Write a protein that binds this ligand. Structure first.
Ligand SMILES: CC(=O)c1c(C)[nH]c(-c2csc(N3CCNCC3)n2)c1CCC(C)C
Length: 126
């Protein structure tokens, strides 16, 4: 079995910015989810080899995880907050696509997503 290359976290020819919204996404949103008791399955790319999930990357073609998001934020990879919000939403959606309703992993994603929504509700104006 093989894992794919992880999502990129640096791309020198991609234009980058540091906005107050992106700062909030790191200092408030990511930090809140990262410290949560249910964060651990989401802190690095899914290791389909070790988890014995050979179909994971057959079903999930746009993988995303908080380790990737954290590095993107720390490296100022994004142009705007919407790009980063999309990454969080991709991460949650992938979990719901792959897994079964009520699975532990889905309950974990739901708990993190609730906090995400609470924090994004107060995203500052630019
Ligand atoms: C399939 C799924 O949606 C999953 C997601 C987002 N995460 C995990 C998971 C478990 S353990 C771990 N890591 C990652 C990297 N660092 C080591 C610990 N990730 C899964 C598998 C759940 C179940 C189907 C076996």
């Amino acid at each position: 079995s093989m894992n794919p290359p992880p999502p990129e976290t640096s791309n020198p020819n991609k234009p980058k910015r540091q906005t107050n919204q992106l700062q909030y996404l790191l200092r408030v949103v990511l930090k809140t989810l990262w410290k949560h008791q249910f964060a651990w399955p989401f802190q690095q790319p899914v290791d389909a080899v070790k988890l014995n999930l050979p179909d994971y990357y057959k079903i999930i073609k746009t993988p995303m995880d908080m380790g990737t998001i954290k590095k993107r934020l720390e490296n100022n990879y994004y142009w705007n907050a919407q790009e980063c919000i999309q990454d969080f939403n991709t991460m949650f959606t992938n979990c719901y696509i792959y897994n079964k309703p009520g699975d532990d992993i889905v309950l974990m994603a739901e708990a993190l997503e609730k906090l995400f929504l609470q924090k994004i509700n107060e995203l500052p104006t630019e």
